[PDB]
Copies of this chain bind each other. A is one copy, B any other.
């Protein structure tokens, strides 16, 4: 349950990643693959090695999707609908990976937004990535 402070919190940290959203995306993916090797089971077709053009492209796509969730915080359901569809019916990623990626993006942000990565903004983004997760795993069954 995103509160108005939470929503604010989130619009300010994210407005700051700004033109770097894509690199933070590719970065959060590389930390996940290294820290949580099981998540690589989903990208058997990707070159997962360092600097992969595949992981890059992919980071951008994920970061683009976050950006749009940020700008529709208010109606994430409708805004992320094509995607819970994709995840639920085609990709079929087990719900537990959503938390692993969430953590990794939290860690990329801390490392890059030293000044804004405040405890209250930390609690907010955490709640944020958690509802994006719920929306994306909402049509699994």
Give A contacts to B, CB under 8 Å: 1, 123, 127, 138-139, 141
Give which listed residue, B1, B138, B139, B141, contacts A139 with CB less than 8 A.
Answer: B1
| Chain A contact residues: helix, strand, loop or mixed | loop
Chain B residue with Cβ nearest A6: B141
Contacts of A138 in B (CB 8 A): 1
Number of copies: 2
**A127 vs B141: C-alpha distance in the bound complex, in angstroms?**
8
Contacts of A139 in B (CB 8 A): 1
Chain B residue with Cβ nearest A138: B1
Contacts of A141 in B (CB 8 A): 123, 127
Contacts of A123 in B (CB 8 A): 141
